[PDB]
A and B are shown apart, each in its own frame.
Chain A
């Protein structure tokens, strides 16, 4: 009798998964990114080295990273909207023997 992902249910939160399908290129060489599909989903987010300040000459901006451990299937280039801001997926470590993955998220807004 197997249930490991039952641990991810103790702490979770509603983040909007945003699955992506690629586009193509205009005859002039430009790029067209399209085909988003949204779905509310549950994750277990933890702040592994989040919100590092950067006082560049151009001003001040932060560097935010996170980890996910979600039950659904998420690829390497998708989006997850959490706490009102979008995060792009660095890298996933899927475990198909069970149902869950592990994801690195970086904040998109500069």
Chain B
């Protein structure tokens, strides 16, 4: 999706300024999973007219 700002952070490691850089990289992607679930496959309906 985006690459972010790039900083420079030299650090005194092992008797020597060690050059370094760091950034943030962000991806973007859908989700996958799966769970077992139950389903309807028939119906039933009752209709009455109260007062004929």
Q: Hey, which bits of chain A sit against chain B, CB under 8 A? A: 61, 63, 88, 106-110
Contacts and interface: CB of A to CB of B under 8 A. Distances in A.
B18 interface: yes
**3 shortest interchain CB distances as A-B pairs:** A110-B14, A88-B15, A108-B15
Interface string B18-46: 10000000000000000000000000000
Contacts, number: 15
Interface hub of B13, B15, B16, B18 (most chain A Cβ within 10 A): B15
B6 to A, nearest CB: 18
A110 B14 CA distance: 6
Contacts of B13: 110
Given A108-B14, A110-B13, A110-B18, 9 more contacts: A61-B14, A63-B14, A88-B15, A106-B14, A107-B14, A107-B15, A108-B16, A109-B14, A110-B14
A34 B39 CA distance: 80
B7 to A, nearest CB: 17
A109 B14 CA distance: 7
Contacts of A109: 14
Nearest to A62: B14
B12 to A, nearest CB: 11
Nearest to B20: A58
A61 B18 CA distance: 14
Contacts of B14: 61, 63, 106-110
